[PDB]
Symmetry: C3
Subunit: 562 residues, 3 copies
Amino acid sequence: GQPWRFSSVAKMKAFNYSCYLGSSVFLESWHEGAGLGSGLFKVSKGTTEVGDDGSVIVAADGTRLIRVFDGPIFADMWGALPSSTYNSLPAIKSAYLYASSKLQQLFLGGGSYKVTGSSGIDIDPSLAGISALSRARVDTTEFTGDYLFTITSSYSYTPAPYYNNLSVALEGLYVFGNKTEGRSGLLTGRRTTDGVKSYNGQTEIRNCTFDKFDYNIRMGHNSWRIVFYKVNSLNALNANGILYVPSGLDDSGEILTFYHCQFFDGAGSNIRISCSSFAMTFVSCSFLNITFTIDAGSSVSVTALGCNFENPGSQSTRRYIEITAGHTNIFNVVGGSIVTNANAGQTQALIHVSANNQINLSNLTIPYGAHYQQEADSGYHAFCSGQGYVSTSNCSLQLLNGAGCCPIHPSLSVFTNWNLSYANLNAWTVDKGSAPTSVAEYLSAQGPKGEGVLHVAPTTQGVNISQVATVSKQAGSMSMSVMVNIISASSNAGQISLAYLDAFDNNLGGVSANLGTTTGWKVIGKNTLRGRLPVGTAKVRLNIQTVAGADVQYTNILCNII
Amino acid sequence: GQPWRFSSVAKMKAFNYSCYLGSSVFLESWHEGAGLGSGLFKVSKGTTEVGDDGSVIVAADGTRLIRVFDGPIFADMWGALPSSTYNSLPAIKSAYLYASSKLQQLFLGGGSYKVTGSSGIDIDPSLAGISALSRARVDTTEFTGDYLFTITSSYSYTPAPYYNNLSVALEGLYVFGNKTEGRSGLLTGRRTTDGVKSYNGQTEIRNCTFDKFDYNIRMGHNSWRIVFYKVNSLNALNANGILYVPSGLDDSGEILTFYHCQFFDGAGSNIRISCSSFAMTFVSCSFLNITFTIDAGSSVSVTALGCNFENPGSQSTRRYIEITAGHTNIFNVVGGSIVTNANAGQTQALIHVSANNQINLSNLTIPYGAHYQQEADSGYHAFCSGQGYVSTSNCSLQLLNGAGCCPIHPSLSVFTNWNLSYANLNAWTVDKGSAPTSVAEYLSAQGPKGEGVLHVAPTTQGVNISQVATVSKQAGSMSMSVMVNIISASSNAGQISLAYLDAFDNNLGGVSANLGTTTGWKVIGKNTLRGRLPVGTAKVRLNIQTVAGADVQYTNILCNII
Amino acid sequence: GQPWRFSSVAKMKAFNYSCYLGSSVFLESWHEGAGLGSGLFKVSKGTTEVGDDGSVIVAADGTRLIRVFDGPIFADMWGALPSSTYNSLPAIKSAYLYASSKLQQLFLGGGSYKVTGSSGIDIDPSLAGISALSRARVDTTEFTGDYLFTITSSYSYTPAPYYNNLSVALEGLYVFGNKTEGRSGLLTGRRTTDGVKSYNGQTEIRNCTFDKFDYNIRMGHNSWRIVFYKVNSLNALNANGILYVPSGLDDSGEILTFYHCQFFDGAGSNIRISCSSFAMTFVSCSFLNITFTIDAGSSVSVTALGCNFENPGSQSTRRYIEITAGHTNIFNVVGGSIVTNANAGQTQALIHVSANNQINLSNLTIPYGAHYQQEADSGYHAFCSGQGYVSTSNCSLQLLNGAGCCPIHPSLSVFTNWNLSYANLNAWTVDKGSAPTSVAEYLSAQGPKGEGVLHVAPTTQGVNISQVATVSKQAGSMSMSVMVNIISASSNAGQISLAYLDAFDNNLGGVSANLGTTTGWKVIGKNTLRGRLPVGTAKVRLNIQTVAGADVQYTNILCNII
């Protein structure tokens, strides 16, 4: 006795089983003409159950047909089909709720899906997932709600660590969306603090794409570790909408990871980290056109191994990474090339440290271009700004490259008195040859940003300003940069020199630059002052000379080794 | 002619094919009522083969039914069904043995399995695997044996490197177990040295969980590279049972890797590494409540990028990482936050180096708490102990944080004579103002642990002890710590000061502390002696002062920059 | 009405549907006896379409049978079967072309495949892939063509970033091949510069194996990021055939990554990187018997975290990593053990830097053996060579180990004048006790490679040559190495000493060596001159002594700390 065949589920429901003596029936498709989700049912003929659609379906007569499952469970089996104007959220929700019992893995079919409603999907990593192998796409333009996907675990501590990482939680989902207020994408954890303390560890989210949301990815309470494997979010609505963490989080943030992640195409959108005791790692990921901002009350540690910072096409002057306000937090970049393309000026500092915060760079190369003009906004011409402290080791700082190179941060200055903060002539040796009365005094409260300026007014003879510093870590780079203002110019009043000496005061070489003629506050150190120290150097001597007549003034006279 | 239908395999075996003229038959399920593993057979009717259950099954008459395979091969097809009291090991073994021929991938069905017997499973990475997508769970409580899973390759060199990494060896397996002697989990390689030198490279083990075993994971002979992708083992029986490597291994240990691995919930269990020329890498993994111990005869190199060390809830005083005994081996932590929670005292050193061994830390932050009391066990109050050497670069060493901060290791002390090992008053400048006869001599064989103490007994005038050291790497942290004993106290005999000077001996600032009144061996340097060096500092001056009257003694007078 | 059954596709084509009134038909296998790729068709009976084989097949009568698809799409369904002499390339090409429409994922069946023809496969990451779960193997010995696999995306910018990483592009493929000119394997991007600028980002290539090709993997135009997850290529035809990048690439090379990759068994084959602004990262991968060569016009940045360099069995003297010619590029090794096995001499430098190029090493151990003889080819006995600059931090440089240890690179020498490049007696203090006329002058244009030699000819009294240097980073290693030539030998004219001093000139220890008797240019510093600096050392003093009578000469007198 071969089983009966049904073209559509409506026909199966219509047919009465009073006189039908059969063990099983076979449906070719749940929808007429779709040809998807074929299934095998067995008639119970007397028992009563919940009566779901995909499983234990109910007919008009009353008998319920129990589905038999072979291999993986498909979510399109219930009611889901690829379309552009057919709702499929109830079918997916019912399939996931059924898969929660006798926990297994839930798979989505191919094609573009459409979902609408007012409720999101509660993904439990310890129970099931929405993993889709064949590049599933869902549409959420018509859908309205706070969150489409929220990931949390109901189990407190007993079964969650035992079986949480056996399979991924969400794979192969491309979500559409529109730019409206109050509608976001995926939340990790729980939106509310009350309830049971969730334990969702080792939860995977791989090969998924979110876009056109107010908050692409948001971190909630009790989401301490998550593995994002190659996820990219783009085109957020407002600033800080790509990856958000509220400051009111509790007991969360234990070594989150990103594996070849990406954040790009940010039309006025940022990424903000604001939490206490929050650890994050990036491995071999590049995010571009994104301003990575950090303002946390307590220590937040973010590390980046092989992270690429760039901007392929943009005329904006946004800065790459900044720390706005914090007590003490760290930023780590290891072995990731940084490249800046052409722009119509920058007038900004690419990376910013404030208060007591620190960024550490290692195995890095520092690019330079002819369109930085960093000195316009933050005084000294350098690659950084702010009162924070920057420590770097083994950085390349490529030499040559047309215009030249620039210092990274003034905190690495070998000279103890560069910005004239000592309020006197300390640490600077002045020599007025032959006739006295040459003016080389120091006045304060006048400068590009308020720092003191050390002007020299020599008459009928030159004056020499010399200082000696000690080098560290053997060979390095010089990366000179000095702000120079010339109130009166009659000739080439230049000849600013830097010399290398060994431990026994023997000359090994040097570089010299000439002060220009323009009146405005120029920068000297773009070229003809860079180089690599000869092997065996011990000390660096700075000399500043002015010819008789024209009087000048200098500021931010700083070296920056390696 | 539609094929015949069979509800159960027993019915198919019973039915005689003498008068049956058919090409194929269809079974709905191998077990009656299970509804799993439906299959299609074709009758051979005359040929003779081995007569396995899943493939080329044999009937009572004698004819053998050859199974036809479409798509992937399912292991539950043979005899396996999800249950709690039904044995399934023979079915899995037969399925894997059949999959070894015409090598393919073997998939397990969903649900909780049960296995028992006395033999383990020999997984050959170059032939097949036990990859299970839908979160397969097996039970091994009733099972007895040396090893449930042993991974090795029979091929020597010809076909093994060619096709070994094409697919994973074991995926989606959660194993149960009980705490009994002699029963362990997964072994990599061969348990015996004799035989053919196996070549099992690029073998994957992903999304699997082991627990309640004597040895959760053990490494055997000829297991030189293995990729553990998000594996966690917990609740071992004895110490060192989570990840074991015997010292008798040969030609093994070439750059093993762990990707977001985990070791936690260790109830008196450790992880031990003891091998010669053994390389291991950790990437973005956190193991907690685990004492990572290393005692190897020769060089063992373990690196950790983004590794988190912590203890969420525990009152134990266990130490995180230790090197017990070795010739010369290295430990590497890069960009992984270390956090210590509240405890009722520590009385131990969190990380330990012995003999000539070294740990290197970089891009790290050093936490501090008010419940360390590290000075109780290993003399000086510091974050380390032992005769080993510790080198760190770019470490954060957060400042402030309530009580303060502590030095990491004494080997970074800038002062050449801190523990009074010179057996004299060298490197210390003593000044007894006005009247002589003030006693500041040095006596040995008396101290907290046996090191010498430099006591001062000044009368009717104070005595000053001064030393000068040179700073490196520009700005850093101070992290003062000194053991102080006061035999007699009459007033505030304090005023221990530290001052910063530039290259030209100009004052830039300083920090001072006051010696207490309690008789016992206190520590000074928890607070009011920490700070960040001003930009441009060159030298650090240490001054120790004692008021006339009370006599004191100091030990472990050490600075620790960065 | 049960559907009709067809054993073979030829029988289905032969049967006429004029009088057949049926809705669907079922084929057991496309080939007779194969028993693979069973499928369900529905008769259109009047419509006209393209008439492909796997989909919408066409019969002899004229009616076309539309296939119905359930779950994933299988590529073996069209015409592919595992064999050794049956062509399957047209079937795979047709299956991929059909899968491009209504984009989904394409899966290959098990068994060894055979492909032949003259055209390659155009894999579009944004459309479909050739992912094969069950270890698919294809044979390309008979196949002839420029490239078997070429990966590129036709989309410019609109839909490519939106949906590119949803699934892998190629998984589980083992390709065979023969060593012939003009036949290679997988190319990324486009072979020609003209056309549309492709955007193929986040494209995965995992668990695949290539061998016996002229160019195993080649990078083409517009291939800026690719994720190679555990790929290994071996046995290339010519040199530089394992992983090739032409110098004519445009707008490509943004942070490429390798995850546990491998390159081994290279029979006269190399890996060459030649491109401008090219970023590459290696994570936990080991490549052996491969000479990693870099010669790029502009800055190329390659980083390696946990990379293992070794040679299990080989008598060759090839060098591990070299930079032939470049402006300024960087090489980064972090936390990856380097081990060298036994050999019948080396006579070469293992790692090579040229011109202004730099390699940075960190968290590394430097092995040593008794069969290096590095001084034979490149003058000084060291672990490096060339005019480039090497910077290292936190390196282990294991001590002891039989013969001893060797310096890494001369650019870290603490002495300013080691190779006698000053053309005089500067930086060297000479003391001729008692009688003058002892000869210690310097002559040039004579030496092992042309550098000057400082010979001493003392009579009736010894002469002492002393120098003082400053130590950095506190404790380190010495790693002495000096070339010594003895023209005349009458006794033990040795006693070359190195001493440690603190900041106040107090002895802390030292190491001494004795010059031999052999006439030839020997090396001194293999043993009895290594050690770890005591805690608190500040200066290192070098002393060279010669007894009266025999006259000697020294060259490359260099220390190398850490």
